[PDB]
Structures are given as C-alpha cells and as structure tokens.
C-alpha cells in the first residue's frame, strides 16, 4: 500500500528512476516521467500488492466515468456498475485501490472504492 499514482506523479523524476532501477527496471532514463511511473506500478502490481489512486469523478454519456486530475493517459476508468452500485456522482472526490490495464485495455481501472 504506499504507492499512490497521484503521489508518484508529484515525485521528482530522479527519485522515480532510483526506485525503478532498484526494482530491476532497466534504463528508465530515456523515458518520459509518466511512462516510468506506469512501468513501476505494473511491475509492483505483479506481487499482489495494493496500489491506490484518486481523482474527481466525471460521468460520460455511455455511463462509465473517469477520475480526472483535479491529462488523459492517467485518468482512472470507473465502470457503470461501480457508479450505480456505490451511488457515485459527477464531481465526487474518490480514492480507491486501482489496477493496471490488462490486455485490450488502455487505462488504469478502479478496483475498490474508498480505500
Ligand atoms: Cu504499498
């Protein structure tokens, strides 16, 4: 539980490269900051550990939502069933356990609200 995507984005890149290289992640030094972060989370998620995220909900016309930073690629996807089961509304500030995209998916996704 100490890795939170919002906190990682606010961490200086030199500390991110150190963490990543310590995890055995090879040459993060050519990557953009956002990509180093993703790389770390994906690798860390393979151990079964919880990882967290947070943002401001916006519900789109199809019924799913994103948690926005209060830039797209790190917006967190929120399914229709989660919005309706937990009564989440546009503009709520949400925190929860997230998961990396699996194959076919493009965005990190909310796993559990309210953690
Ligand atoms: Cu942790």
Backbone angles phi, psi at 48, to 5 degrees: 90, -5
The boundaries of the domain holding residue 99 are 50-115
Q: Are 31 and 19 in contact (CB under 8 A)?
A: no
- Same-domain pairing of 77 and 114: yes
Distances (CA, A) of 10 to 18, 38, 58, 69: 15, 14, 22, 12
> How many structural domains is the chain composed of?
2
Sign of CA dihedral 51, 55, 57, 63: negative
- Could you tell me the CATH number of the domain that includes residue 3? 1.10.720.10
- The strand pairing partners of 76, in sequence order, are 67
E strands, the chain, are 51-59, 65-68, 76-78, 93-99, 109-113
| 95 contacts: CB under 8 Å, gap ≥ 6 | 52, 53, 54, 113, 114, 115
Q: Which residue has the tokens 């994906």?
A: 42
- Same-domain pairing of 38 and 26: yes
- Same-domain pairing of 43 and 97: no
- Same-domain pairing of 44 and 54: no
- Same-domain pairing of 62 and 112: yes
Interval between CA 61 and ligand 1 midpoint (Å):
34
Can you tell me whether residue 27 is helix, strand or coil? coil
* Joined tokens for residue 36: 């180093």
Backbone angles phi, psi at 62, to 5 degrees: -75, 0
Interval between CA 50 and ligand 1 midpoint (Å):
6
- Give this entry's resolution in angstroms: 2.0
């Amino acid at each position: 539980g100490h890795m939170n995507l919002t906190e990682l984005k606010n961490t200086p890149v030199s500390e991110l490269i150190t963490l990543g290289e310590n995890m055995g992640l090879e040459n993060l030094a050519r990557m953009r900051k956002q990509d180093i972060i993703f790389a770390i989370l994906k690798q860390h998620a393979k151990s079964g550990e919880d990882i967290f995220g947070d943002g401001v909900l916006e519900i789109l016309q199809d019924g799913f939502g994103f948690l926005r930073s209060a830039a797209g690629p790190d917006d967190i996807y929120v399914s229709p069933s989660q919005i309706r089961r937990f009564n989440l509304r546009t503009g709520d500030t949400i925190s929860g356990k997230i998961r990396p995209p699996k194959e076919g998916e493009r965005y990190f996704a909310l796993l559990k609200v309210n953690e």
